[PDB]
Amino acid sequence: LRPCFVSLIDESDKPILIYVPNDVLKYNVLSNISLDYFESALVEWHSLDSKPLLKSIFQLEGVSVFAMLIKQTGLKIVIGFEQKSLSGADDEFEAINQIFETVRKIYIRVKCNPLLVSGDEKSIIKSLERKFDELFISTEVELLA
Numbered sequence: 001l002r003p004c005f006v007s008l009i010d011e012s013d014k015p016i017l018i019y020v021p022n023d024v025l026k027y028n029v030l031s032n033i034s035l036d037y038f039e040s041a042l043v044e045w046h047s048l049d050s051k052p053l054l055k056s057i058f059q060l061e062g063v064s065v066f067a068m069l070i071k072q073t074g075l076k077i078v079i080g081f082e083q084k085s086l087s088g089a090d091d092e093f094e095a096i097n098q099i100f101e102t103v104r105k106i107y108i109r110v111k112c113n114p115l116l117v118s119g120d121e122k123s124i125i126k127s128l129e130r131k132f133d134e135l136f137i138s139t140e141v142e143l144l145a
């Protein structure tokens, strides 16, 4: 379940980052399409209960795109996966949900990092990218296989 891309967008609809682990045009387009779902009058972003809801919003060019809105903060998370690799099993949706939770925690830990909290946006973005690399980047060994 290696993501194709991870996008974070803030409560005012300004992108925080579009991360691609390792085209940049493709995922910018997919991210923009996703923002249209967040703005739609016909999308329900929440469950009956308070647990944040994972949504499968669309699939395009072999990328299955999932998204979530954090009700209380307005944070928007968008993650794409390789569609042909997906089983659709319950355990896989639970794994995808875990990835959303982990991405959110990482974000909160970076933006409220004891040093970065008082620093510029560029430094937060750089830190987010390295934290996401530790999770998502394919190793030399994985690439050769």
Ligand SMILES: [Cl-]
Pocket: 070, 073, 075, 104
């Ligand atoms: Cl949040």
